Design a protein around this ligand. Structure first.
Ligand SMILES: [Mg+2]
Ligand SMILES: [Mg+2]
Ligand SMILES: [Mg+2]
Ligand SMILES: [Mg+2]
Ligand SMILES: [Mg+2]
Ligand SMILES: [Mg+2]
Ligand SMILES: [Mg+2]
Ligand SMILES: [Mg+2]
Ligand SMILES: [Mg+2]
Ligand SMILES: [Mg+2]
Ligand SMILES: [Mg+2]
Ligand SMILES: [Mg+2]
Ligand SMILES: [Mg+2]
Ligand SMILES: [Mg+2]
Ligand SMILES: [Mg+2]
Ligand SMILES: [Mg+2]
Ligand SMILES: [Mg+2]
Ligand SMILES: [Mg+2]
Ligand SMILES: [Mg+2]
Ligand SMILES: [Mg+2]
Ligand SMILES: [Mg+2]
Ligand SMILES: [Mg+2]
Ligand SMILES: [Mg+2]
Ligand SMILES: [Mg+2]
Ligand SMILES: [Mg+2]
Ligand SMILES: [Mg+2]
Ligand SMILES: [Mg+2]
Ligand SMILES: [N+]
Ligand SMILES: [N+]
Length: 387
RNA sequence: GUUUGCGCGCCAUGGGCGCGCUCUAACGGGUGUAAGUCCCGAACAUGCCCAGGUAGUGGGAAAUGUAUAGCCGAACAGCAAGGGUGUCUACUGUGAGGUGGAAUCUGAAGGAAGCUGUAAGCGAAUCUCUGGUCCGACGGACAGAAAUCGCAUAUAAGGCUAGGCUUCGGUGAUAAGCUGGCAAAGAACAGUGAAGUCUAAUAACUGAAGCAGAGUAAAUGCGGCGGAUAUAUGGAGAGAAAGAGCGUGCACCUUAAGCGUGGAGGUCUCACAGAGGUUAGCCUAGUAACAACGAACUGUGAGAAGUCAGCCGAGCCCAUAGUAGUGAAGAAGUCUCUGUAAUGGGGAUGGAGCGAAGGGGCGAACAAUCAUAAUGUCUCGUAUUGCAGAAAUGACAACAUCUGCCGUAACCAAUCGGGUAAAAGGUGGUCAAAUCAAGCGAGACGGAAAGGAGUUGAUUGAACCGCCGUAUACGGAACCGUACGUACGGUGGUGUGAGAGGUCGGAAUUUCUCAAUUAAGAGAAAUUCUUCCUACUCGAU
DNA sequence: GAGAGCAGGGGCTATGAACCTGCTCTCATTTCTTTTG
């Protein structure tokens, strides 16, 4: 019956729509995602019969569009009921779940008083699992042998099937967390487990590693998995800290995520980048919206204002280098309100770009108000608006 | 399409090789056959230091100037022949046009071999040693090339900017260079500063190594080797060594804005004829040119402005033109020494030739594209086999798993000693399974289906970035530039900007027609995209 | 304006780094050219 639910016209159309919304690469067949509608209209009976009589290929990284499409169909039918059996503190590749929820729940549990963190990471996941125990776990849940044959055929050969099957594999780890009596959140093969004591956390860590290497079959990494205080814990891009009052543990953008944002911002504000500065401002704005929307549940106000000053400095260097020329620099400085003596003095200091864009007449002519009216969004103001 | 940028000729105020005349170290001495060379003797004025941040006097150590004949002339100021304008005014031509004034810009990095006065800088054979800088292409530094070696270099080597931490801590002056947060180069100013050399005197009153970070790039950095170095490159030691100015000779050699002179091809104007249109009369264009409207085209003569930008282009065609110009002070040809990566340079004969300019066509060659008997396998059996689950009975008291401590200072955060599967404990018993057995696979082992392991031609190469060698000139030695400076030779790299006009060609959309007044079928008017052309207007070099 | 420091808090991973407040403090520039992306 579950292959009849896979091979039902609504599900096939939704898998097609999700594939053409993804707009992924073609694969080994080379077929376009725009070609998928024609090939469905000309092989609907062929695809459905080749799947129902178990003769289908899983042709083998990017999957082929027909392979990714059938993977989508099985994933849309198997993300429910598996989602019904899942735990509450699992947040990765699930509907209505994200990293923000994980950080909120981790903060609430640490604020209960579970200071010591057990970091457990699963290493090289779909390589490490054997297919038979995974697929008899799926068989414990799914009773239709056609689904078992097609899913195993996809495993012996990313797309939405793979994180679902991974979350099925790690739901046993979550189940034994609930059985053991432990507080945790898990996104997707990265889980932090929160207990109260160092002896407790070491014992929990070794018991978990023994469980995963024995019962689950996966092998955990000795390098990435560790025990740590929340000051030393990163999780889904978030660092952590303790507020000086004891009321809250509070989320912090980790230094790696801050460095990622700074790298993308320094790319988007290159001086020699030949696009117009309105385009750089627009791309910078979109990057700022994405990063602030990810980290608005963290505490980064000093970081936001320092990054604002950095962005404005780099944009002033961009504008000054686009003027390029001492008469052009003097003309625009006089236009923006600098007197001609200071404007000529600064404009014939056009080389030393960083120095003159740091201070003085360039800071007055290219002001924060004028950059705001130019189109630049402050990190601080958008951050205060978001939370 | 970047003031100018073409051919040919002339001319040094440019450079060589000679001849002369004069001058050469503040002012004097010496030393000496011989002094511009080597040595010796003052003052004044700055630089620096006697400091506490200054002045003002007293003092003093190195350094510089007055103060070598002389050179040069700022990114210094002024003058300035000329050039441009779609600005304005006059005159003259029938017109294309021309000439003269004002106004404004310009007078440039390549010949008025522009002119005048500076600031600053420089300023003497040769040898030896040494510092710094530059070069050994281009190319993120491969490939290709005639074109250094090794290493490293974009989740950014490296340099630089502002702080922090840990250790330490007084001689200074000359002085090329280095750096000032980076595309590259210069000039300016500031801070430093290599190599050595020189000094380490006097007296007072009134900053270094490192260390991790942060920020900042149109990318080269370090070391070796070889070479260059008159911005008269910083110095040290030798050196009785040359340097400068003026004049004058050489069938001396060269030069893009100087002087003279040529401008085809296209474009435009006028006058005659023919061809036309319209009312013997008048016109022949315009829309940038092609195209299309239009009667507006064709000859002949007379004139006017005017050329002159490498990118695949040897060579041939048109016309100035076999003309200007060069050639007998000796051409072409031939022979012979040779050089480069390539372009060349001598000689000896020979006796006359050689031979331009702008713009269009055609085009060899080159580059890019375009065309011309197993395994395995489908379906059978054979023995197995991977991973679920349930359970007749045995073996035993240990197996997991979750909660973080002990004492002491009269009172604990290894705050004080010890430990971290440390106390005290909870929680669930722990496996071994005879038997039975799911679904999906995996290999074997055989038996039959099948199945098999260049030529030639066409299109395109629109434009652009350069680098390198020689010659020849400049800004500003080098480096960067002057259209890749230009000319001639070599080499890589990028790829077809916008508007407007045409093609209104090909394909799509709206509406008609055919099909049958049926189609996501075909044709047509319009529209859009698109192939292609046009410096016509910009933009880029 | 961009960039620093200080304190100035408290609690815990306690003689450190986290954050969010302030003060409080500096740095002010070649009055010139040239050439390609
Ligand atoms: Mg004398
Ligand atoms: Mg005497
Ligand atoms: Mg000149
Ligand atoms: Mg000149
Ligand atoms: Mg003078
Ligand atoms: Mg002088
Ligand atoms: Mg000198
Ligand atoms: Mg070179
Ligand atoms: Mg290079
Ligand atoms: Mg760096
Ligand atoms: Mg000197
Ligand atoms: Mg530079
Ligand atoms: Mg200089
Ligand atoms: Mg030499
Ligand atoms: Mg000197
Ligand atoms: Mg010339
Ligand atoms: Mg004429
Ligand atoms: Mg001309
Ligand atoms: Mg030409
Ligand atoms: Mg061309
Ligand atoms: Mg060509
Ligand atoms: Mg021309
Ligand atoms: Mg062709
Ligand atoms: Mg010079
Ligand atoms: Mg040079
Ligand atoms: Mg050059
Ligand atoms: Mg140039
Ligand atoms: N020109
Ligand atoms: N060029």
């Amino acid at each position: 019956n579950l292959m009849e639910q896979i091979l039902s016209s609504d599900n096939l159309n939704r898998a097609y729509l999700q594939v053409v919304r993804n707009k992924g690469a073609e694969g080994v067949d080379g077929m376009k995602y725009t070609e998928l509608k024609e090939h469905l209209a000309k092989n609907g009976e062929t695809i459905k019969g080749q799947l129902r009589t178990r003769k289908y290929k899983p042709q083998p990284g990017v999957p082929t569009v027909t392979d990714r499409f059938i993977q989508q169909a099985i994933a849309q039918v198997l993300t429910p009921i598996y989602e019904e059996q899942f735990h509450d503190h699992s947040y990765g590749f699930r509907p209505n779940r994200c990293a923000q929820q994980a950080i909120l729940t981790a903060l609430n549990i640490m604020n209960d008083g579970n200071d010591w963190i057990v970091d457990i990471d699963l290493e090289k996941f779909f390589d490490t699992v054997n297919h038979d125990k995974l697929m008899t776990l799926i068989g414990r849940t799914i009773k239709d042998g056609d689904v078992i044959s097609i899913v195993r055929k996809y495993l012996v050969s990313g797309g939405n099937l793979s994180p679902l099957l991974a979350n099925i594999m790690l739901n046993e780890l979550d189940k034994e967390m609930e059985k053991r009596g432990l507080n945790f959140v898990r996104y997707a093969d990265d889980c932090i487990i929160m207990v109260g004591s160092e002896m407790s956390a070491n014992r929990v860590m070794r018991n978990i590693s023994r469980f995963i290497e024995e019962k689950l079959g996966l092998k955990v990494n000795m390098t990435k998995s560790k025990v740590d205080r929340p000051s030393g814990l990163k999780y889904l891009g978030f660092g952590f800290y303790f507020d000086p009052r004891a009321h809250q543990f509070k989320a912090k953008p980790h230094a790696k995520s801050v460095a990622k944002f700074k790298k993308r911002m320094k790319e988007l504000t290159c001086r020699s980048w030949g696009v117009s500065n309105s385009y750089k401002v627009e791309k910078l704005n979109q990057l700022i919206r994405g990063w602030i929307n990810y980290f608005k549940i963290g505490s980064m106000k000093t970081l936001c204002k320092e990054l604002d000053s950095r962005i404005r400095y780099r944009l002033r260097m961009c504008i000054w280098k686009q003027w390029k020329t001492p008469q052009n620099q003097e003309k625009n400085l006089v236009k923006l309100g600098i007197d001609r003596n200071t404007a000529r003095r600064v404009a014939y200091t056009g080389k030393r770009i960083a120095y003159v864009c740091n201070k003085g007449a360039v800071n007055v002519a290219i002001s924060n108000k004028r950059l705001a009216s130019f189109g630049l969004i402050s990190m601080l103001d958008y951050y205060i608006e978001k939370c």
